Design a binder for this molecule. Sequence first.
Ligand SMILES: Nc1ncnc2c1ncn2[C@@H]1O[C@H](COP(=O)(O)OP(=O)(O)O)[C@@H](O)[C@H]1O
Ligand SMILES: Nc1ncnc2c1ncn2[C@@H]1O[C@H](COP(=O)(O)OP(=O)(O)O)[C@@H](O)[C@H]1O
Ligand SMILES: [Mg+2]
Ligand SMILES: [Mg+2]
Lengths: 418, 418
Amino acid sequence: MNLTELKNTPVSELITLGENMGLENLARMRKQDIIFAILKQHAKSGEDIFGDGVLEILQDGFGFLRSADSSYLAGPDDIYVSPSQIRRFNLRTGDTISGKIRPPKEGERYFALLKVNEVNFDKPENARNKILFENLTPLHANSRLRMERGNGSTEDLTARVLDLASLIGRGQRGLIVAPPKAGKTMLLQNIAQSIAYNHPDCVLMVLLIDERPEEVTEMQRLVKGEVVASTFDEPASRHVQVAEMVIEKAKRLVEHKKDVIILLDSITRLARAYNTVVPASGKVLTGGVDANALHRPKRFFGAARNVEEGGSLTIIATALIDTGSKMDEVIYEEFKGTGNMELHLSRKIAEKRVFPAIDYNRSGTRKEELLTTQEELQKMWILRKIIHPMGEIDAMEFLINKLAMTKTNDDFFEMMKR
Amino acid sequence: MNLTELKNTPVSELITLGENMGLENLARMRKQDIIFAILKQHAKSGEDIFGDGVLEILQDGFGFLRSADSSYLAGPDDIYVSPSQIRRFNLRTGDTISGKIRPPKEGERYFALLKVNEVNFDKPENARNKILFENLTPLHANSRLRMERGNGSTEDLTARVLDLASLIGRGQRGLIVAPPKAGKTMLLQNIAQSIAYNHPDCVLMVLLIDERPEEVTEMQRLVKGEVVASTFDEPASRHVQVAEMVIEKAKRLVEHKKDVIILLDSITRLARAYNTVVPASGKVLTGGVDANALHRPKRFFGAARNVEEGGSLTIIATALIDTGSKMDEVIYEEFKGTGNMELHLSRKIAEKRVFPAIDYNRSGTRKEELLTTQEELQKMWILRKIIHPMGEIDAMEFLINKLAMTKTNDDFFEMMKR
Ligand SMILES: Nc1ncnc2c1ncn2[C@@H]1O[C@H](COP(=O)(O)OP(=O)(O)O)[C@@H](O)[C@H]1O
Ligand SMILES: Nc1ncnc2c1ncn2[C@@H]1O[C@H](COP(=O)(O)OP(=O)(O)O)[C@@H](O)[C@H]1O
Ligand SMILES: [Mg+2]
Ligand SMILES: [Mg+2]
């Protein structure tokens, strides 16, 4: 049987499956414990057992196949891979390994990988000869990711305003600058629907850091792609771990010429987690931010690029402002000019219960001429000139009215022309 | 007899009963000591002795049934539970066990459990087949907890303002941000009265950390549920132990499809106790707070959720500000955005002797559309639009003035519409 199918069943069915084959007292233990006990019980009978997971390599040399179902949390059901296997196949962290596994022997605590069947959704020989991510040439985004779905209404105005204000291309480095309760979470959710419906080919990953468990459940049940999260209950080490796990998996996928999109909420919380984890270097900036603490977060943000050889890595991360913590302000100030797309939300627009609370004038994209054609760019500059003189709330109200009058951004543009 | 009646008996009547049995020198020792002496003297007679308690499994394997009457304080009247019983009945910390108990034998210092009769207010065989707490998927609160009472005080008007300002649902994660002497204690008292009157089915728990003994007595004599408190003249380990017992018992009750509400005063004192207890990790934040120190309080505060499978855990904790202690502000900083509901008390409103001193414009609830109907939500949005331009002192003066002229919140909204 398969490990992923077991991890995808709810706890009740896992308990029933364990009980009807001989296991007992499975109800009160953790899901990973139930899965591990079921795996051992099935292995006692001797049938082939399959599994898969994203490889994480530890300092000692051996590695473990973490599962995205549990957001790459270490557990009894993790699959052990020996350094001999990590050297026989040239494997790095973030590699998606799928194959047969074997029960632990006397003196082993984890299931061990038996036969490698696929590496990064490809044969091991082909994945053996993939150029490393850092050897690829970054480029400006040139393939637009359209947000207008064309299937929804009465909230698709958010996607249409996104298309009017901030252009997202394959390989974009997007930063969403929003105060708390400004609508960033469901803005990301609507972006997720836009990406899933418009671009099924792109691999979509949603990364949540220090996020409430109920929102984690909503995001998981709501997004069609892969959602991994680390709640505020877990330590900053877990936030770090999931951050590198996601970024390494994305890099490995991009190495196979795949477009990978990562929605991050938030870069500020990840920066705080990194500041907590990394040792103090003796130089501490204002707000308690260690100077060296922001190196690793930026490396996460700087991985977003359009690869000339093939594929791309788009990263759209949210930045928190006006939260009352000056360390968040410092983190934002260190991440200001890093991204090439900016999307600003304002509390003033959100207070009047009018959404999306996008600050149209302060939002924009760099090198936007590559994403679209000349005439669409002319129409967008006409719209920019029209919107510019008037204030944030008036701009958003005007945009929402004119978009609600029409059905598509095109008809809105001819209506502006007329 | 049954131990619960003995522990709820006043000390004087306990002394008289023990003297009637034939004991002596009872008056001048601890209440637990008198209870233990009475239990031994009566068990010498030979008829059945009953007991109730909450299980706390020690690091050595065995456990102790504690009592909420003494706030789970270790004492001679604790019931001893062998690891064999923790294995035969699948038992965890926080389980409520009631059954026969037996006198200590030679070399035994505690009464020992003899026959397990009821676990978590259920038969032992049913309690072992309950899915563990963190195997249940969290959800947003959808069942509102009405604060407005049919009692009709008409001098306090706190529950009505709570309804007008911040909604509380089943599974809510609420945070009360208040300066000292602003009305925290009686705010929690009104919340507890509303919970007891409107929702008798919900299990109500009041958790007090570093609390003055007089207010512990007041809270016990006022709240109709369970009050477990730890005074400031006790070690931080005592506070931590009380918190773990309360949270584990709440989780075990939620596992039985029960709605459990915990009122905590305060999360700041609990964070200080955890910081004192936990070993230093080498990374100390501003204000002398260890990085890992806040990991365990969050696991408390993050345990609040609405369970899809049934039941919920609401936690309303008070956060303290303007105390002049950098530890307090930092604790507030890592607890700022972790709650669904926020309710802010203002010193300036309190010093005007107008109550409740709720900062209406800064208090609110996330996903409040899931707790009320569309019409009530529209009326509440209208009220927020009216109040938003006003200053918080003036806002509360206006709100109380308008509320006093009406009897119910619905009548208040109808008057506002007119
Ligand atoms: N595009 C939108 N349409 C309707 N309501 C919105 C929109 N954006 C935000 N809101 C409102 O804002 C509230 C909170 O938004 P949320 O996405 O949680 O922002 P944040 O993640 O910054 O807290 C929601 O209850 C929702 O009603
Ligand atoms: N809802 C209220 N109604 C009337 N008086 C209040 C109220 N809340 C606070 N007070 C006043 O505040 C004083 C103490 O409030 P308390 O509940 O001790 O606040 P805290 O717990 O923050 O010290 C009381 O003497 C009382 O006069
Ligand atoms: Mg959010
Ligand atoms: Mg008080």
